[PDB]
Structures are given as C-alpha cells and as structure tokens.
Amino acid sequence: LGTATGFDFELIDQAGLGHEKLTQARNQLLAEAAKHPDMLTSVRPNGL
Amino acid sequence: LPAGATQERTQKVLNEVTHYYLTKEKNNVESVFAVNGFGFAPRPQNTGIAFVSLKDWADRPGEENKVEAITMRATRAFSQIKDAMVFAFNLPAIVE
Amino acid sequence: STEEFGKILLKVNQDGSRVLLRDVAKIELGGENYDIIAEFNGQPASGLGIKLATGANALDTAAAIRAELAKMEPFFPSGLKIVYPYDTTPFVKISI
Amino acid sequence: NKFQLTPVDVITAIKAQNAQVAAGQLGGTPPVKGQQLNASIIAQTRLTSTEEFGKILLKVNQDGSRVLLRDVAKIELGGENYDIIAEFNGQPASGL
Amino acid sequence: EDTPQFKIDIDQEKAQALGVSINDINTTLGAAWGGSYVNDFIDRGRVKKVYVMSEAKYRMLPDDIGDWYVRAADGQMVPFSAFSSSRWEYGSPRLE
Amino acid sequence: LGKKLLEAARAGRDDEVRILMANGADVNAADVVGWTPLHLAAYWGHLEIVEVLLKNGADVNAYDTLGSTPLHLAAHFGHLEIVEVLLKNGADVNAKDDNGITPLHLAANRGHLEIVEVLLKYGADVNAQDKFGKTAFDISINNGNEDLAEILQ
Amino acid sequence: SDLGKKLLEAARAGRDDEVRILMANGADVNAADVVGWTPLHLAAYWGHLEIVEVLLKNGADVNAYDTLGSTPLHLAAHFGHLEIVEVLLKNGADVNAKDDNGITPLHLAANRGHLEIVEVLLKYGADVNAQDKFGKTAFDISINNGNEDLAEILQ
Amino acid sequence: PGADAKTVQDTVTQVIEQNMNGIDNLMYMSSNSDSTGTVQITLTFESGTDADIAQVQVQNKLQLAMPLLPQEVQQQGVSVEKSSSSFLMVVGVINTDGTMTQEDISDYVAANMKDAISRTSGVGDVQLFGSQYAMRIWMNPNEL
Amino acid sequence: PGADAKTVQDTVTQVIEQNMNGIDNLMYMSSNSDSTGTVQITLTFESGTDADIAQVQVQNKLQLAMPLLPQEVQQQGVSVEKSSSSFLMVVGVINT
Amino acid sequence: RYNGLPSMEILGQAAPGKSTGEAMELMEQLASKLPTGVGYDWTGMSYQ
C-alpha cells in the first residue's frame, strides 16, 4: 500500500536522450518540486 | 508474381494497383497502404498486398459504389497486368 | 556508431600499417532485412500490422492500441504522423 | 588403427560431408537496382543413403590412395537403439 | 512453382588437398551471399543486431562466386572456383 | 512469344509448342539462366517436345550461362529416349560445361548404365577429365558402382 | 572535512548558490574523494562554468591530479566544455599535462572530435607531437577515427 | 537467415513437427518452408479449446525441439503466437515534411512504437511493415 | 557475476524486455540493472489475472530470449517467480 | 527502465492538509515544462 497521500512517479526517456540527459531532467523536476513545499513534501529519487 | 520475380517487378505492379485506386476510384477510395514483399505473412520480392480504406458509406451511394462492385471492377482492370495474379477481395462475414 | 565499427582493427601488416574494417567493407546503419517496403497514397511509409489474440475483444484491443499510440505522439520527431489506412473495428462500432 | 584414424576423425568427416548449408541467394535483397536474376544458392544437402555415407572421404594418403568411411566401418540402416524387441504369438512384430 | 536455383558442389578432396577447412568455405559463402547475424550493438540506447554480408554488387552474378577467396592453413588465398563446381537445377521456393 | 514457348516446353504441352512455332516463336529463346525450350524438355523429360523442337531447327548444342547443354540434363536425369534422340540430331557427346563435366560424367555419377552405353557408342571420351582431374571410371569406383566400373574397363 | 564533502556534492550537482555559501564559510577547495577528484575536477567533468570560475577565485589548484594523474583540463577537454577549457588555461592550467597513460588534454579532445577545444589547446601551446604510452599523437587518433576536419587542423 | 526452402524444412520444420505430440484437442497441423529462410507451423484446435493452454502445450513441445535446431535459427528467435490469420488494423506512419525516408520511419516505429503495441493485452501478433536498423557491414571480396 | 549495471542492462535486461510480447493482461513492466551483477524485471498484471497463467506466459517468452543472453547468464539461470513481499516467519540459524 | 524505456522512479507525498490528487496534478504541471523527449507516467499506488 505504501503511504496515503504518497505518489509513485516515473520520469521516462522517450527519444533516446540517454542516462546523463534524463538525470539533468530529473534534477530539473526535483528542483521545481522543492519550490512548492506548500503542495509537495520529500519529493526524492527512489534510485541511486 | 511468379517465384523468381524481383522486388522491382512487384513494385511496378503495386504502383499500377495504387494508381488505379487513386485515379479511377477517387470518389470511393480514401487511402491505399501498399506493402512490397508481404502477402498474409512476409514473402520477399514476388508478393505484394494493398490495404484499401473507402470513404464513408454516406459518400458512396448506390450498389456500384459499394465494396463488391468496386473489387469486381478492380479485379477486372488488374486482369490485364502481365506475369501477375492481381485480384481485390472483400474479407468474408466469418473470415474463418 | 559506424565510426567505431569502421576503426575495428582486423590485422596489423608486417610493415606496421593497420587494416581497419572500413578498409574492407562499407559500414552504414541499415535494416536487418530489405524485404518489406510500404507506401501510403504513394508516399514513403512504415507501419504495424496488428492481429487480434485468440478470443480477445477487437474494440477493447483497438481502444488500448490508440491509448498507447496517444502516449507516443508528443515525443515524435518533426513531421512524423500516424495514419489509419485499414481498421475492421469502425464498422463494428457504427453497424451496432 | 591401420589408417591412423579415430572415431573423432569419423564424427568430424560426417559433420563436414553430411551437412545442410544455408548459402544465401543470387540477386537477394538489398539488390543492385535493375537486377533480373533472383535464384537460391544450394550448397551441401543431407546424405540420403548408405552408399553416400560409405563414400564420405576421411583422408587421402601420400601416394594419392583415398580412405573412405566404408573402408573403416560397416554402413547400414539400423535402429536408434536395439533395446526393445516385440513378438506376436512368437512371430517378429512391432507395435504402439 | 519450382524455379531455377544455383547448385554449387564443394569438392572435399580438393579443399583437403589445398588445406582449406569446410567451416571457412561454408561461413564465407553463407555470410557473403546470405548474411550472418554476428552479435548486438547499442543504437541510441537500444540493443540492435550487427549483420555482415557481401555489398550488393558482389552477390548479383553467378561469376561473382569465384571472386570470393578462403585462406588455407599454409596462408595462401584460394578462390571458390578452385574447390567448387556449379550447375542450374529446379527446386521448390515453398515446401508445404 | 519466345517466353510462352519456354513455359509450354517446361509444362509438357505438346500441342501448345507446335501452335507457338506455327506463329514463328524463337526455338533458341533463352531464359535468365540461359535455358532454351530444348533444355527444359530435356530436364523435365518431355520426349515428344524434344523431337518437335529439333525438327524446327532448335540448337542441339545450346549451352546455358554455366556451359550445360540439353544432353547434360537428359544424361543426368536418366532420360534414355531423349539422350538417343539428341545424339542422333548431332549433339556433342564430349560437350564440357564451365566445370569440365560431360554427359558421361553425370550419367555415370547417378548410375544410368543404359545411357552410359549409348554415350560410349556415339564416341564419348572415357578418359575425359573434369576440373578436378576425375574420369567417369574414378566416379564409378568412388560411388562403389561395380556394374559401371566393368563397362568402363 | 564535513564542508569539504558538502562542496564536492555541490560542485558536482551544479548548485551555484550553495557553493557561494560554502566559499563564504571556508569549505576546503582542495577536498578530494577516494579517486582524488577535487570540487574543480567535478565541476569540469559535469560542465559547471560559474562554479569552475568561483572555485579558481577561491584558490583552487587548477593542476590538481587524481590517483591516475588526470587534471580538470583533461576532463573539460574530453567532455567538450569549451568555456571551462578557456577559463582553466587562463588560470594557468598545464596544457601539456600527462596522466599515468601519457594522455594529454589534446589527445582526449582529438579522440572525441572537439575541434574548437583542439584549436584553443594548440593556441595555448599544446605539444602536437606529444605521444602517449602507445607512441600515439593527437594526429594518429584523428586518422584512426577518420576525422578529416581534425586531421587537417593538426597539419 | 540465407536458407533455401529444403534447408529450412529438413533442419527446422520436420524437427519441430516430429516433437508436436501429446497436444490436446488438435484438429490438424499445416506448415510452409520458404526460400526466404522462413517456416510457419499453424496448429488449429477444436472450438472451445483454452488458447492459453494450447499455446503452453505447443511451447512445451517446442522447447524439446529447440536444442536440436541450428544455432542461427535459435538466435533469430522462435516465436509461438495465438492470433487470427487476418489483420485487426494497420497503423501507418509517414513524414508529412518528407524529412525521413521509408528506412528512417521503419527504424523509428521498430525502436519507439512496436514493443509497447506488442505488449498491449489483446495483441496476438505485430508485423513491422519495414525493418529495424542493424549495423550493416557490407563486405568487399576484392579488398578482403 | 562481476558485471556492471550497463553490461547487465545492454546484454540481459533490454533483450528480455524486447521479448515480453503476446502476454495477456499486462498493466506495466519495470526493471533494475545494477553493479551487484543483477537484473530484476517485475511484470504487474490486471487484478483477477491467473498468476500461474501470467508466470507460464512470461517464462515461455523468456525462452524466446534465453539463447540471445550471454553464456555466463544462461549458466547462472534466469528465475521466473510469482512476486510476494509477505513472509510467514524468518527462521534464524546462528553459531554461539 | 519502465515499459522498456530508460526511467527514473520519484517518490513523494502531498503536504500536510493537501490531497494526493492535487500533489499529482502539480507533478504533471512541473513534468510538462521539462526538456524535449522527457515523458512521465504513474505506477504502483498512484496507478490504481
């Protein structure tokens, strides 16, 4: 079940961008989510 | 086409089939998707298939503008093509 | 890349000179096979010939395919477009 | 022992001389545009008789005299195993 | 229907005499004229196949067979014409 | 027209072969591999067509793009009547394909003893060697055909 | 140090405003991980120009070498970061710096076909005849790669 | 790859066919061996047969034949599918700006579209009208 | 054994993922390739799917890919199991 | 990888007093302003 009010999001490389570009895009999304503490809490990568 | 016939010969015949539907059947045929080296399964060089989509039934009034009459006229026109078994067919009610 | 395959070292000659793969072969990014060539109303095209799994619903499967294609469209290169040249499901929907 | 051979030499010979080789095509895809000839290349096929297996060439001696498989072995059609023998009322028989 | 096919016979004695392995003959013929799936590579993040094959222009004509050289144990390059013979025959392009 | 003759010869359509040559179809018309109507009749063993083609001035020594003549095909596939008809119409009994293989070499390899005797009778060279230096006798010994080996001394 | 390790993560991540605060608090600019990579190494690799400039202003070793002898200019040149290559060379980066393999920034730039960087390195006095452990020059690399543009520049 | 009709039949088709036994509710079995280097063996089952079990049973018998098959045939992949013979639909892909060739579109469809459509529930078989790109080493005999 | 994340992904994970076709009631598919020398592909199915039919269909399609995996991976074996994250108990065994 | 494409899993939760649906809506908004060829999807608890 996980946590209630908790979400499970997948960022997908749809055009053979590669690992490096998808990381930069992930960092870009995580940075913007951190500017909305009013709405989003503990938005983090599940991976390494 | 008979086995031994080249990919170029099959495209030549597929062009004639595509030409017919785009020119002689403007009012009935919407699109033609022709594939070289394919029948019901892959079969390089001597085999081709054409998927024909007609315009809406409303825009095709009368019996002569329906699939049966269209495929009859098509098969008759394509009978003239040399060294090629070319026929249009409406896939049945129960195809099986 | 072709460049990397091109500089594959086959042998070093007795005088120290190198024989690369590009010295004995043309290296290009081409098809697994060259058997199947498709056209849409005369234009260069590819596509997917989809067959219904035994006992599966045609309309539900068609809907599930369109849902999956809808996911892909936003990430297409410039100009690439999906066309619907052959579908047996519209008639089922409309006839019913 | 007389011809200085082992079962390894016999097995190697059978594999090389009882082979079914895929040898490709003349004018296969992708062709040079304008190719007329499209023919399958037929190399080695499986041996079909004891006579063909018998004349499998194992080696040629220094004096040009040839050692065939039939010179070091008996060749005949015989059971995969000789383990199961049936009789119907004392009469030689097989069954399922 | 049955079609003309290019029957080629590898002379085992002559190949043995010149020191040319039958595995090298079969691989050279198959790879060049039929194509050979070697291994996989990564094209823009996706696993895809690597194929070796003759450039179209060297697998179009019957006489091109003799342009393909196999290296013997002694290191001498041997043309296919040295250890092979060919003739035209008829066979099935599709056995049911 | 020459295309319809090749197909008619292959299929064994006796009547069709005559009708096409009554309209003056090329008797020496060659397909992509260089096979004449006489080649196809010799291969598929259509005796009646071989006779009809030859009397209409068919090249008896026509050779394909690998040097094989109709006598090569008839001798190889055991068509005795066709081998006899061909040889009587001045077919080269010692004819060599690009590999140096002769009608005797082929007939010998498949063990057609009746045809071997006909070829020998029409002046076939028993010592004729292919590109690998093999005679019809060398083939008879290798195949283990003891009946054939005796005929070839 | 605590801050030294925080600066490594900041320089890598490209967190300009965090690096700004760390430089003010005096986070060790000569801080190094197990492989011997300084904050400047990381910034040069990941291509963070402003942090490269800020670190060099705060007395970072421009010729800091990892445990295999690679400098920030090696990383900048190899991964096509033109602006960082220029900034490094202006702050006295050794243009002819050899790693443990004898590989120079010119070798790495040539191998990846970075034409602009090659011309910048050649301008700052990159030894065009410099050989690695395999006796290979940047020219030998250009010929082997089949880079006709680069092969011309190095002639 | 590069096999004639007889080579395919006598090294693949016959080997698989001889292993097709202990299969419930089988009406008949038909196969083609083409000079395109292709075989297709269709096993037709009694009406009301579970298509899941039918596939499982055919697949169970195929795995016994797999090690006997040539290594080149194994590496091409031997698929077992439970679908209609006819097409449900054709999804055509074109470039309206004419910036991509027939080969470019075929590769994109193969690399970006085909897989997801093939895994969709109800899709028994997906045929690419074209080829996925491969690294093509076009050999020259004169230079070799 | 001794494989990095990319080696696992590009020689195992991508090959298996491409062959997970024609399986019924698949909602989504996820995978991890890591430098412990490990891949785990989780296929999640529609609620009410027979878990045995889901497993056998995945397992069967994995054999489509098994000959395309590295010899070292074929040797270790590729486990297909019904996923469960609930243990009845953990029995610990210690030496005092 | 997610559905055969390179992916990166991101976990997070709706802030105190906010619903999971609202937190998901913002994540979709933020995700639609990422570089070209970067898609997204909902998995696990978020999917169902």
Numbering used by the authors:
A (entry chain B): 674 to 721
B (entry chain A): 578 to 673
C (entry chain A): 242 to 337
D (entry chain C): 194 to 289
E (entry chain A): 722 to 817
F (entry chain E): 14 to 166
G (entry chain D): 12 to 166
H (entry chain A): 50 to 193
How is this structure described in the published paper?
In an attempt to prevent ansamycin binding, we made the switch loop more rigid by Gly619 and/or Gly621 to Pro substitutions. Most peculiar, under FUA-only co-crystallization conditions leading to binding of FUA only to the TM1/TM2 groove, high FUA concentrations (4 or 5 mM) were mandatory.
